[PDB]
Amino acid sequence: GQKRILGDNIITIIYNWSANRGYIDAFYSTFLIKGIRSLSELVSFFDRR
Amino acid sequence: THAYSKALLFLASGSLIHSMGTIVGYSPDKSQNMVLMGGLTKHVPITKT
Amino acid sequence: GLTDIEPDLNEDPRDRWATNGVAPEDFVYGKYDEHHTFYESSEKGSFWGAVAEEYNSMDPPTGFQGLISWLFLPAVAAGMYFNVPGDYLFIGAGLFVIIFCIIEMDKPDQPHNFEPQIYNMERGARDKLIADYNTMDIWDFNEKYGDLWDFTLK
Amino acid sequence: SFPWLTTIVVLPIFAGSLIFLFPHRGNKVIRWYTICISMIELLLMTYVFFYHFQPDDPLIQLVEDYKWINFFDFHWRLGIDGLSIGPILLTGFITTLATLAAWPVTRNSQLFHFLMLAMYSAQIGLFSSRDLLLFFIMWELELIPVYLLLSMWGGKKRLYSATKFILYTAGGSIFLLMGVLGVGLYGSNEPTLNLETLVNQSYPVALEIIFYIGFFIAFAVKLPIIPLHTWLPDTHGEAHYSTCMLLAGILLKMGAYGLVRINMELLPHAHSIFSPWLMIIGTMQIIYAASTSPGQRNLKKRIAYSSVSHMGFIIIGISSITDTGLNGAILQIISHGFIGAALFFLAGTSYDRIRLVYLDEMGGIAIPMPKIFTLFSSFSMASLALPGMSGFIAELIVFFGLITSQKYLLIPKLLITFGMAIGMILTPIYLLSMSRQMFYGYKLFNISNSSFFDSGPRELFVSTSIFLPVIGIGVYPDLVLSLSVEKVEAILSNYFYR
Amino acid sequence: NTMLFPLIILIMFTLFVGFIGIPFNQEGMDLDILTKWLTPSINLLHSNS
Amino acid sequence: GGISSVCEPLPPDRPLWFPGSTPPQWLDGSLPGDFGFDPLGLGSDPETLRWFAQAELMHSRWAMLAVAGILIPEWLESIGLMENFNWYDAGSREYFADPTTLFVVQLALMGWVEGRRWADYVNPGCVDIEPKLPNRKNPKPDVGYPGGLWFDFMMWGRGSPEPVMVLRTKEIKNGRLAMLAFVGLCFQAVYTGEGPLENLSRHVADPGHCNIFSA
Amino acid sequence: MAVLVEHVEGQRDLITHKSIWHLSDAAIKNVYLFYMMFTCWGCCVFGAAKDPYYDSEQYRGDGGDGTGHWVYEKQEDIEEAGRAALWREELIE
Amino acid sequence: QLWLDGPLPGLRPAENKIGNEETGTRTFLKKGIYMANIGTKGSALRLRKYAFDLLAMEDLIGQDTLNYVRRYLRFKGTFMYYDFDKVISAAPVADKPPLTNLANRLFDNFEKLQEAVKLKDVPLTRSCYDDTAVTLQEVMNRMA
Ligand code: CLA
Ligand code: CLA
Ligand code: CLA
Ligand SMILES: CC1=C[C@H](O)CC(C)(C)[C@H]1/C=C/C(C)=C/C=C/C(C)=C/C=C/C=C(C)/C=C/C=C(C)/C=C/C1=C(C)C[C@H](O)CC1(C)C
């Protein structure tokens, strides 16, 4: 019956933890990297207009 | 201790990837996938040890 | 580059920060990256033969110009090691520079030395132009093909 | 007895005036004559530096004084010291190499090489001028050559860039002239413009502040100081790369040289008043330009904003009142003159093959052009303040000069030390990205780009000959600092209690 | 074989490098190679034993 | 086109030890370092020629190891990183065991491998040391030039960078030079009563004197 | 002489060798002079050398002249020349 | 407060009478050198270390490198001058006269060495530096 008590207890959680690299790196993409990109553009805007 | 054991394991993994690249190609998405990698005890014994 | 036909404008936007190479799923690993594309060959040439070929492909100065260009730096190093007066070094360096530049002025002109209008004329006319420029005096050339340098005439 | 500096100043422009006597066509004879003149002049400065310049002397050397106009008490006065010989040698080296790298120019080669020799003469005349009005004249003597070089050999937006450049420089230089008039007329008996007698002048605080502002507006227009930097991105981006050598390696350092020679030396009290406000401006300039650089899709604009960012360390070393800070500022002057010129040269040579501007479409250039990739990576590492290069030791000495400074106490000394540190986090962020958008990845290139496409012997020699002093100074910085450790101390001798 | 030889050397290193921190053939009072190497060494937990 | 792993014999017009002379008929250039030097005709019999080639190879390798182990420690002692090195007196030093029992142990251990080499020379392929991995194919080695995993862990032979004949003549020439060097060192240690590098130092200075004729 | 031994209780003793050495100003001037002569020699030699790309037909044939704006001007020129060729063709016909 | 307003402070006069008798200060002192505040123990350690650094200056003495000798002498001399002032000011009252005498002799040796360097006289520089060397060895022996 592919017991759901086992599927999401470890396998889904462990696989998502290992595949998403612990969710830190994506956060570093979402918070820092893209943000600094936007900041750069904003600074460029203040240097252009 | 860890530097020597780590160099041993990394060089063994590299030799094994080189061995698998002749049957799965040179793509690291295929030549470094342990899902498609079973049963190498018979083929690479020194790397196995 | 240059387009003789107006190119199709980019309808879909592209990420500025993305790598401009091919997609990783379209990458032929081992060939696009030169990782399995060097198979050895018994037919490997000589090391010094390769050195001579690479040196000669650069079109070195030959004769007296080649002699002074080869002997300048060791002479300067020897003069600085032997504690000879440096004024002699400056005199020699200036003489070498002047002699080299005068010899290079004496060398014949090539098609690439002139304006793009002169480069992109008829090839036979350009060949006759280059043959004349290296043969007659500059005053005769200027009084004969002067009007070719008035780029507004045509 | 022999007028060495007068001969050095006069020789390039006088020789370039005779370039119009040549009736030859093409560019071969013209460029070989120009490189002969440039190398002869370089050997002349080498002889002067070798035999008549003493780095242990903190006084003026090889002075020459000829009265030209009696009404202004105005003299053709020339002289070198530890401050000026470095910029003079850098000017000669960079101008000779820019003449060598401007060899594919076949359109109006005569005027191009005449303007190059005129720029040579004008820069050398500025760096060796001991008269205030002579300094102003040599400062003004480059508006026309750079304008013509931009408008006749620039990029797509060359004309607007040239107009903006000449108008901005004139707007700064009128304030420079007002400062010259104010300082040279302060004499109670007769006007005087010699820097030697002006270095002992005493002013009231308000008048000294006004004169400092008048000089500083010009030196902030020329040396890029926020927010008087807007001429630089479009001027350097849309200029010829050979002209970009002089623009980003020599002409930018002239504002810093004027800041040391006039603002730091002649007016020490106003400089002590203005320096803590210059520190914050320099730190914000570093951060602002290092953040503007990722926002530029154009490669040359990114390099120009990188130059603006690198000028902030010079501003910090100026404003930090120590011998170490001034030595670091001079070292950064030399390092940037060695780095920015080569970066602009590589960018121009790469554009001559790829013929693309924006970074988001220049992938895979490392495959047909590996040598230019290697040189670009090495000069980016030099830009990155990597050790073994002059940039790292320059920034480190500037940091030490701030840390050892006695004017500032603790907390600002922290908040500035952290400040430039953020800069050396931001400096990788675009630069490597630039390389990642300019050389990394795979693109299918034409077969004709397989051969006769990479940098030839001339470009390889130019890049190597500018790269070697970078390594030589990053290993042994005292190849430069020992020329100016004494004179800088004299400049600092007026900032302590007496 | 050029890949296999460093693997053999690292196998030997992995087998026989743990005996530089453990005493090799202890007979009574014997200090190992590492503690004799680091004779002045910080040890906060075992500063008296 | 690829990598040739077979020795290429030298052409009959190869340079000789005595130019202008006729090379002997039993020296056809198929051996490493073949310069047609056989005044006494010792290599007339091909079987004895093979045995003498193997003996020359063995003497070459032992002589190169010997001269290296003499010179490099002597060069270290002159620099100062060796306190009391002396190759002549090295045999009479005090070790953890007597020279006789060390000699017997060395005799047993070395007569194992020299005797395995003898069996290989008599019967090529009778003793194989290179592993027989399941699908790896082991190339057949030449007698006196073995080596898979152990003796040739670099794969510098078998046609890699320089062809096998070129590297074999290089080895043989360095070996002959080392044999002459070792015999010279053995005679110098009993004639000059000094070390090798010291003798070189006193010969480089004033070479007109300090020679064989001045002890 | 220029060697200092420090002993610290509970620590291994340290032997420090120091040598305050610096290049003379004459040596620095020699370095500058040799680099200037090397620059002059390289300028002469590598100006006398051939340029693989800037003398090629791939650069000069397209209209290159060493000037940084020849690509855009050539593009606008060929569009204007195409329009003028259409005008010429309509005049002839 | 964030920054100083007036001119930067110059050479602070020593309060242990280790300066010159006529002038009150030493010639080799340089203004603008950053001296870290550690205390008497740190000043003693820096004094010994910089005495060793100045005894590492045999190689720098030559006909071509006298300016660097003078520069290093001024730098280290300012450092050891103020460290000597700090350690004498915190020394016990019984130990102050010998320390002051040793400092006075060392600084007189410094002046003699600088004077010899100024005239570009190499044997005079060597002799003055030998006297300075024995004084510096005495300094490290006292302050070990
Ligand atoms: C293989 C090269 C070789 C080399 C480089 C040397 C080097 C040296 N020997 Mg030794 N030597 C050698 C072999 C060699 N020897 C041989 C084979 C023997 C005898 C079997 C000797 C016996 C010997 C004696 C008795 C003495 C030296 C001494 C010396 C010095 C030369 C002066 C002289 O009188 O000796 C010349 C002696 C000979 C017997 C000549 C042998 C030459 C052989 C046959 C051939 C070498 C030639 C060949 C072209 C080598 C290439 C040269 C170079 C590229 C390596 C010099 C440091 C002398 C010494 O140091 O005194 C202070 C001295 O007293 N040697
Ligand atoms: C260790 C012993 C040794 C041996 C077995 C060989 C063997 C061989 N040599 Mg090599 N050779 C050697 C050392 C040796 N060589 C040395 C030291 C040199 C430099 C001088 C050379 C230079 C050389 C050349 C130039 C050539 C050969 C060639 C040959 C081959 C044919 C000749 C022959 O039949 O040899 C039989 C040899 C022996 C059984 C040794 C007999 C020696 C007698 C009994 C006494 C030894 C003499 C004396 C003690 C020397 C002392 C040193 C001297 C400086 C005083 C054969 C493979 C030829 C070739 O084709 O290459 C493959 C050839 O052209 N050899
Ligand atoms: C002196 C030069 C020399 C040369 C040119 C050759 C040449 C040849 N040999 Mg011979 N050999 C030599 C000395 C030499 N040998 C010695 C002293 C021995 C006795 C140990 C042997 C015994 C031998 C065997 C057992 C085998 C060969 C093989 C070969 C081939 C391999 C290529 C080569 O060796 O690298 C050329 C370059 C070098 C020799 C450079 C010198 C090495 C330096 C001095 C030290 C090595 C560095 C470092 C310490 C090693 C790595 C450290 C690691 C263990 C941690 C080639 C035909 C192989 C064969 O023929 O198969 C086809 C074979 O397996 N050789
Ligand atoms: C006598 C005298 C006298 C006087 O007194 C002085 C004088 C003059 C100095 C002297 C002289 C001398 C001489 C000349 C010598 C020579 C020598 C030699 C040749 C050596 C070699 C030597 C040589 C050697 C060691 C070598 C070795 C080698 C080896 C191990 C190898 C190895 C290997 C192999 C196999 C293979 C693989 O794959 C890789 C490897 C792993 C890498």
Ligand SMILES: CC1=C(/C=C/C(C)=C/C=C/C(C)=C/C=C\C=C(C)\C=C\C=C(C)\C=C\C2=C(C)CCCC2(C)C)C(C)(C)CCC1
């Ligand atoms: C300031 C000045 C100067 C001077 C300078 C100097 C003083 C220099 C020196 C220098 C030196 C004293 C150096 C030394 C050494 C060096 C080396 C040793 C190098 C090496 C390198 C290599 C080998 C390579 C490299 C490369 C390249 C080229 C590029 C690419 C990358 C690479 C890295 C690969 C001059 C005159 C210019 C003028 C102006 C001013």
